[PDB]
Amino acid sequence: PISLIAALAVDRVIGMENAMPWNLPADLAWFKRNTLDKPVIMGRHTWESIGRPLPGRKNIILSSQPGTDDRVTWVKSVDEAIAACGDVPEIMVIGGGRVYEQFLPKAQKLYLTHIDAEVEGDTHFPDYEPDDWESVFSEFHDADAQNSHSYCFEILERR
């Protein structure tokens, strides 16, 4: 069922002023590879930050208020969000901080990008207990012409 995918800078920073405080196209490529052809659930702030439907994925947006874009599916609770996914091999929760906090107890997999950048944030990833998770995949990358920081990809499975 349920996986979280997120990019974390130092001290678990994920956001500032409704954007990610870095520019790493390599992370966005990894995000696309790991979410294409799967339903994605996101909070209203994250939907507004992205500003457009993500192609090739059913887009499900959480909000307490009526929906404002007929191109995507709007739901008023976590229960309704999961129901909107139907029966699929894997549901991807794609942010932001408030949505991660509610779905982390339900998640069996974490797809994490660890970014070597010290940046200010106003939103953090929830503090998960590392003893509850087994790292099943990791991959390290240096900065390059397109990616100003080094970063590492990791997949954790719930023990």
Ligand SMILES: COc1cc(Cc2cnc(N)nc2N)cc(OC)c1OCCNC(=O)c1ccc(C(=O)O)c(-c2c3ccc(=[N+](C)C)cc-3oc3cc(N(C)C)ccc23)c1
């Ligand atoms: C899928 O996307 C997103 C996914 C997620 C969830 C998510 C992500 N990851 C992981 N792991 N888990 C997750 N759950 C969250 C998102 O947001 C919260 C998000 O949205 C990001 C959208 N992408 C960019 O915004 C983006 C990415 C790369 C670039 C880039 O520079 O290449 C640019 C870019 C600019 C960025 C900032 C800027 N200024 C500040 C002035 C000016 C820019 O000018 C440009 C001019 C160009 N041209 C053609 C001239 C071309 C590009 C740019 C923009």
Ligand SMILES: NC(=O)C1=CN([C@@H]2O[C@H](COP(=O)(O)OP(=O)(O)OC[C@H]3O[C@@H](n4cnc5c(N)ncnc54)[C@H](OP(=O)(O)O)[C@@H]3O)[C@@H](O)[C@H]2O)C=CC1
């Ligand atoms: N990997 C990364 O680094 C990522 C970072 N981000 C960043 O995260 C930040 C956004 O996170 P955050 O501010 O916590 O906001 P969220 O994106 O988590 O959206 C929160 C909103 O979602 C709606 N919502 C949440 N839970 C529920 C529920 N149970 N029922 C109904 N509606 C619900 C509410 O909308 P309403 O007010 O309409 O009721 C709420 O205000 C941004 O800075 C963004 O750039 C986002 C994605 C990935």
Ligand SMILES: [Mg+2]
């Ligand atoms: Mg804009």
Ligand SMILES: [Mg+2]
């Ligand atoms: Mg990731």
Ligand SMILES: [Mg+2]
């Ligand atoms: Mg600081």
